[PDB]
Design goal:
The structure is a homotetramer of 228-residue chains. In chain A, the strands form 2 sheets. Chain A has a 5-stranded mixed beta sheet. A 4-stranded antiparallel beta sheet of chain A has the order 1-2-3-4. With 228 residues, chain A is an alpha+beta fold. The longest helix of chain A is centred in the N-terminal third of the chain and has 23 residues, at 61-83. In chain A, 39% of the residues lie in helices and 25% in strands. In chain A, strand 3 and strand 4 form a beta hairpin. Chain A has 7 helices and 9 strands. Chain A folds into 2 domains: 1-70, Disulphide bond isomerase, DsbC/G, N-terminal (Nuclear Transport Factor 2, Chain: A, Roll); 71-228, Glutaredoxin. At the C-D interface, strand 1, helix 2, helix 3, strand 9 and helix 9 of C face strand 1, helix 2, helix 6, strand 9 and helix 7 of D. Chains A, B, C, D: It comes from Escherichia coli (strain K12). Chains A, B, C, D: Keywords: Chaperone, Disulfide bond, Periplasm, Redox-active center, Signal. Chains A, B, C, D: Homodimer. Interacts with ErfK, YbiS and YnhG. Chains A, B, C, D: One of its GO terms (molecular function) is protein disulfide isomerase activity.
Chain lengths: 228, 228, 228, 228
């Protein structure tokens, strides 16, 4: 390791890998308290710059590289895991913005977020894909399974949220083996993603990195979730 | 949303969630670009502080929270995918530090890393769990499968790396269907993790967050991989 | 000193003073390397936050404090030294934005800056106060003194810069003792300010802190110098 | 201005000047919210890095340049202004660490800081140079002038601080013209430096930049003031 880069390491940076940078410069990708950072060895070999590289078009190439190499892989993986799960559709199947939501039937903020989304969902801009969990209340699993068990689960969920949970249900005698697997898989993915509270909302940034909102979003966060 | 927190939002922060803070302060967890941020609403309710909260023992509580809820979770599921793969054990089964490495039999730097790890593996501190791939050379798949086919594949791999790849092998007539599945599964997981160069080394920080090293680690990164 | 604040000290912060903060919080003003920092002790007294406090109107109060008490004061006395020097007035005497420039008659970039400043000087927004020096060419002292010796030195300087240095002058037999004192005093003050290249341009920020530009400013710096 | 540097300017940076950097790179010195920053244009001309450059010996050359060009000139100027003022010596005239203190006779913390300094002063390591002011109490000017008027002012000040202000004085009928000038000059310099409270303590860092402490220093700040 070149001496200038060793000196930057002592400022609290752990190297991940080298990469090729412009202008004869050698790049080092690393982390500082778990955040990605970039170091550039100068052409002379005897200096190094810790910081952010921009190009002529004004792109922060260091941020682009950090996002591509550190954050995007795990985000794409979790996005696919949610896509392959047993989610309920709310909105148009071809709506261009996809938002995943982990929701419990006895969650007040879940219904409030449902309400917030209506202008985008009912205009075809956003589809919500709901992964039901049964974690808040003693009756949460049986009620979520009852929704999964109904003739049209996506419709029953819409009525359940729209009615504030006043929708009457025919709750089965037991949670079926298929319903237990759906709920336990969705709960596993929710726990993987680190939110213990519903709604747990996941969406993709324009840079293809996974983003999160937990609880009822404020106006700025809501508009970003919906793709404004 | 309180006016001081709205003001901080306008500096480029997107709020994820609220959380409980001490002293009658309310917390807001957010991000600036890719960086986690914590905001604390003052008891007067008319001010908010963006920064890092420390307790009496000197812990940076904001960093603990940001690591636990932002940086860490997305990689947890691929850590489990590595654990569920067909890895080879190098070290004690009860060694407290687990390190996964994606290695090709014809990778030079893999062998150098193997040697560098000896003090920690031999002490019982670290176990290396190797996920073989066959991606570098035409003979890489068959040689990797030959190691998997031997009577004690983990011992054969250790001897192979120790010998610098000179260890002679019984290379079977063909790659078995089980060996081909292992190699193809491992290669897909390696690709999903985002590093298509060996060695690709994965480990957990002292904050329990997934970390990566690609290529031969330098001395500082090696120490950190080994938990030292 | 409260334990959480001691913990922050150990991260490389040197405390300057305590100060009053809102909400029953105590403030500490300090520095990390050359950077000002504010720390706030929580009402619980067992936590402290290093960061930036905002109020309801969106003002960054920590930045206001850091600028007022750390970055600003040291330059205030040299701003007064410039005001007490023998400068030439270009613009209205009541123009609200004051800009000092150290200029040599044989400086090309000085003339380009003079032209760039015209819209603001002619509007009455900005007054340029020129402190002549004679440092570039053998004839620089005599030419500067000749401008000072003319019937209306400020007008002669404006015409000289406007002409690109082509304006013909009456250059006296010698530099008078008063002109030599002006030039030598101005050169010493220029040296004290730390820039030995002309134009050396000094102005006050909207935060009332002394600022410097050396050489011909680009468009953004020009706008900021001019108070725009 | 090269396009990559223009793009960094839009991140809130105001350019001061260019400078020559190593390895064919061009440097730009600027400020971000009144803090010095450095930008390096890459050899190709089509990228720029905002950040900190280190050399082989581990020196942060960006910090060195920022200190030399932005902070040190005004610090050296104020250091000289204090040196030329009418200060009172406390300690050995050849003590290697010099500390200036603005003090009022009716300031409790001034006497506490006096006490803190005794181990360094009485061993010849530190000299305190006290610039008296009369700003706190109605009798502060006459009492400070009485100390200045005494046969051995430095000794009378030592007795005054050591006795907790219990030292009896012969206060003259009026503040003399010479004493008024000393007090008003010292008050002007104190106001220049931005502290309205005594003790206002000024010392030089190892990097020849002016540093400040206001009020009674804590243990870390005290030891840094004294040159530990």
């Amino acid at each position: 390791l070149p001496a200038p880069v060793k000196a930057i390491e002592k400022q609290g940076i752990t190297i991940i890998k080298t990469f090729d940078a412009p202008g004869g410069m050698k790049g080092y990708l690393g982390k500082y308290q778990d955040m990605g950072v970039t170091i550039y060895l100068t052409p002379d070999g005897k200096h190094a710059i810790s910081g952010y590289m921009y190009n002529e078009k004004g792109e922060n190439l260091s941020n682009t590289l950090i996002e591509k190499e550190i954050y995007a892989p795990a985000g794409r993986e979790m996005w696919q895991r949610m896509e392959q799960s047993h989610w309920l559709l709310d909105g148009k199947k071809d709506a261009p913005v996809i938002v995943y939501v982990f929701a419990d039937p006895f969650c007040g903020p879940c219904k409030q977020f449902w309400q917030q989304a209506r202008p985008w969902v009912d205009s075809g801009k956003v589809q919500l894909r709901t992964l039901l969990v049964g974690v808040i209340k003693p009756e949460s699993p049986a009620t979520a399974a009852a929704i999964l068990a109904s003739k049209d689960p996506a419709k029953t969920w819409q009525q359940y949220e729209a009615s504030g949970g006043k929708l009457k249900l025919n709750v089965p005698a037991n949670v079926s083996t298929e319903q237990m697997k759906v709920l336990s898989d969705n709960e596993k993915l929710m726990d993987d993603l680190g939110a213990n509270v519903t709604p747990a909302i996941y969406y993709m940034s324009k840079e293809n990195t996974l983003q999160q909102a937990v609880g009822l979003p404020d106006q700025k966060t809501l508009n970003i979730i919906m793709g404004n």
